[PDB]
Symmetry: D2
Subunit: 182 residues, 4 copies
Amino acid sequence: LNPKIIIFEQENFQGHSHELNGPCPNLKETGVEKAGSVLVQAGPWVGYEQANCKGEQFVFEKGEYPRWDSWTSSRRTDSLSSLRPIKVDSQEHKIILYENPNFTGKKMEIIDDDVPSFHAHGYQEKVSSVRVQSGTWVGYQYPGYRGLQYLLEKGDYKDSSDFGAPHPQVQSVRRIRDMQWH
Amino acid sequence: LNPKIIIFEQENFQGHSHELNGPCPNLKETGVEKAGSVLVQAGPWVGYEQANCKGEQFVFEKGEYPRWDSWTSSRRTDSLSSLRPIKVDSQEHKIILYENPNFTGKKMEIIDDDVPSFHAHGYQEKVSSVRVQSGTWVGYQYPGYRGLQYLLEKGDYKDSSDFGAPHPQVQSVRRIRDMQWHQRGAF
Amino acid sequence: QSLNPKIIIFEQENFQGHSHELNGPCPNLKETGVEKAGSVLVQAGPWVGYEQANCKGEQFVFEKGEYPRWDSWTSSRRTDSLSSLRPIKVDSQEHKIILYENPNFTGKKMEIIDDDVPSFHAHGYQEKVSSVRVQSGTWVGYQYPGYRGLQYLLEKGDYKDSSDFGAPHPQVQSVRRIRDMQWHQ
Amino acid sequence: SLNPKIIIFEQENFQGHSHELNGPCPNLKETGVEKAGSVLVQAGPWVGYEQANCKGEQFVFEKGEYPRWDSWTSSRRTDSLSSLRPIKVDSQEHKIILYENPNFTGKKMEIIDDDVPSFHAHGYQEKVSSVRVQSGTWVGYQYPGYRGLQYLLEKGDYKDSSDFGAPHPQVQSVRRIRDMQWH
């Protein structure tokens, strides 16, 4: 996707408006010097009181900033003069378990957390293929981490046999988050 | 809502079965004296190798246990002789924010976590009424906890003016989790 | 941590001048002797402040820390700045389990809050578990790491010895918390 | 740390001959291990296999005591364990360290993943003159509850308070930016 923010010259998103999809060192060249309202459609962004991204800063998040003092957190902060999108570094651990081989059918997506019961999460189907984007996981045949263990690491598993399962049945999954070396 | 567990005399949910919606001190009456498989539709439950909920214990959660050794890892466990539902103590911090007054219209559900942007959560509407089921929250007019603050505590807020907002607009909420003292007493 | 909240209002900014310690709710700071609210210093909170008396108007949440100026809690430069205060009765529930080395809740001890512990050895606890105290939550203790071995359902109460939670030998190496339930009484 | 550490014994309850392992072992009987009686994990986690060359049933060994074969498998086998290898765990974190004095000196505070609305409640009542961001995207604030001047803290080193935009070396609350709607 593309970062999207729109600054308005007046309050309550009125008057002239300018759309920004990248970094802006000087805002007077957009037709809006003293911004009155800001609509953030895809961010986040960081704004600065001076040109060329200097001075006091303020972070914009997705939402509506209808007033001139909405995004500031200190009264002595001057008007918006420069703005740029933030390249957020946020890592997560994701594993996707599919009902049919070759990553088709119904799927369940797990992010970071352990799932002791697949049935409680609304997934009562089989598990024939697994895609691990990140993290180290262990799958189990039965709820509560019972039954045969399946170490699931970063990679693709086109078939249940590819991660050691005789039949395509997985009902619980936990994540290994600790490591006493390296 | 009642708990639901089904026990079978044979593995893979075959043979005679018995459904339990409450505790059973002796599985001898249910016709399934040595359960071969167990189906947990609503739990969790805890099983016991002896009657009257004694001996080694096994925790059953929602799902399918198709073998008589599936709910345990020890090989010394005896057959299932009694079961009872677990009265789980799991607390969550819940706040509901509605679009129209009197708790109507589009609603947004927040549990435990902070939300710095209502728009990122799929809620781009106004906030005219609030229902706080549990927890201590602070609502804000603008994303990133900016603007006027509104202390949202346990109870109902039928109008925006009831939680201190003449303007029905909330875009970020954080939960107060820490507290450096303990209020003793009763009321 | 104390038995009462604690906040201090200073007449001037940066915690200078006359100070006024508050240990409870105050509906009107002015009539109590506070000439001005120059700065606010929270040592046992949190608190909520209000622009007007009777806890009305704009609200300011004060947490433990330093609020050295008016612009630290409000963007409007009013002469009142802060007219009332009261301690917040926070509703923050946690699930606490404490496992002791010796019976009757003595010896080495390890406390777990909310989260699951798949390995006691990785958490620094390599000793036996003879007594257990469940403050809140529903827990399952296992005798081996990775939630393997004999199971012990640990619920709200006290366990003086291993036999009280059905353990033949005081050995526990992993505990997980039960967080879901599909039936309501 | 540095190297993994598993120790496998011939008899149960960690009795008999002991063969230490600091890496992968395709075949346990060739390293002098007759029978896998008990397993003690001092630095892991490890993954064991019922057959050689890391094939067959899998057993996850975490730090702790595994005194009998019942602890990792329910099927009695003559050879309960044939191969062992350390797991290369993929576990990402977001750490930021804030130091009292410039150039990363004095008292310090580390924050992992979670937001901190009050440094005083966290046990840190000092100034913040230098910041080291090893991972994640953070916004530091002058006052508790994410108030006052904001400072965007990104991956890198800030040796002085002015390096992250603070003419006054004061930080009392930090939150992490977790979401992004582009790229």
